[PDB]
Amino acid sequence: ETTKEAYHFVLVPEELDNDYWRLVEKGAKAAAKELGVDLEYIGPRQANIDEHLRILKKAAAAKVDGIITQGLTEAEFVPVINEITDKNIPVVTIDTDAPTSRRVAYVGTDNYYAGFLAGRALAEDTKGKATVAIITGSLTAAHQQLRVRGFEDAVRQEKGIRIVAIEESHITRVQAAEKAYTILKKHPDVNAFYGTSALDAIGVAKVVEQFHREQKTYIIGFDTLPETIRYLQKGTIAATVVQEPYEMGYKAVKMMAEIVAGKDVPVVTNTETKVIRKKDLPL
Numbered sequence: 001e002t003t004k005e006a007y008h009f010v011l012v013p014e015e016l017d018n019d020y021w022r023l024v025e026k027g028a029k030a031a032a033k034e035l036g037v038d039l040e041y042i043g044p045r046q047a048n049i050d051e052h053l054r055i056l057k058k059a060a061a062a063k064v065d066g067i068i069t070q071g072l073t074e075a076e077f078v079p080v081i082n083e084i085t086d087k088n089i090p091v092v093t094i095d096t097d098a099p100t101s102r103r104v105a106y107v108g109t110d111n112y113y114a115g116f117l118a119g120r121a122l123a124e125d126t127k128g129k130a131t132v133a134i135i136t137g138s139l140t141a142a143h144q145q146l147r148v149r150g151f152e153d154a155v156r157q158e159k160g161i162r163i164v165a166i167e168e169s170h171i172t173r174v175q176a177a178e179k180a181y182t183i184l185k186k187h188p189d190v191n192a193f194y195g196t197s198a199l200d201a202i203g204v205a206k207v208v209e210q211f212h213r214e215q216k217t218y219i220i221g222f223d224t225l226p227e228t229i230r231y232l233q234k235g236t237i238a239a240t241v242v243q244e245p246y247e248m249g250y251k252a253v254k255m256m257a258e259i260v261a262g263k264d265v266p267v268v269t270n271t272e273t274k275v276i277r278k279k280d281l282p283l
């Protein structure tokens with residue numbers, strides 16, 4: 001660590017203590033241990049574009065050997081990824097891609113297609129009939145935009161599915177729940193929710209269970225954090241989109257070491273995504 005012996009790679013999460021990003025860090029740290037590189041996990045305490053960009057520039061100013069980060073937005077992150085690359089520091093994107101930038105490689109879900117699968121799933125389980133509200137991590141983050149947009153394309157040929165609300169959770173359980181509650185009071189006809197980040201469906205499920213209505217509410221969310229699996233087992237959540245956070249962190253560090261060695265790697269490595277339901281539990 002406090003040695004120049006080792007390569008220094010930085011992994012920047014969307015939010016430092018977000019549960020999903022700590023899983024990504026587990027994968028990255030394990031790859032780093034196997035390779036004998038120093039992996040520094042450095043990120044905003046509270047998700048924030050400007051703070052995220054400040055940490056990227058600070059790591060590049062410390063002349064680290066590689067930087068792994070989301071290309072969180074196209075407008076702000078492409079020029080910064082490019083300027084870092086031009087200072088001879090390779091950039092690997094993780095979890096969210098910036099495909100027009102000069103990042104060397106991406107490891108993460110195909111986010112558009114993840115949302116499309118969620119849209120297919122909701123249309124199948126509701127037989128094409130649903131009054132849908134969407135809770136998304138943010139309206140500006142690229143992976144959130146793609147998961148919403150893929151969902152919308154997938155349900156567009158279902159005349160009986162209508163989206164009546166889209167709200168931001170800022171990837172916390174508490175804002176997801178707050179938004180779910182206000183959606184239900186302004187739109188009492190909502191009977192389906194779609195969450196596009198790891199804590200959204202958890203926030204919705206808490207609010208749905210506090211009503212304990214007879215007429216059920218369909219919830220499809222993202223990722224497989226323990227609370228999500230529990231709600232899926234309870235039947236409160238109907239489905240969720242799988243990602244491979246540990247694997248993208250592990251593979252991003254392995255790719256970075258290959259790049260530092262002068263070796264080619266694929267431009268895009270899409271880790272597995274698929275919709276699972278209660279019938280797919282155990283795992």
Ligand SMILES: OC[C@H]1O[C@@H](O)[C@H](O)[C@@H](O)[C@H]1O
Binds near residue numbers: 095196197
């Ligand atoms: O809980 C928030 C997290 O949700 C995940 O679905 C997403 O891939 C991560 O980037 C992060 O936004």
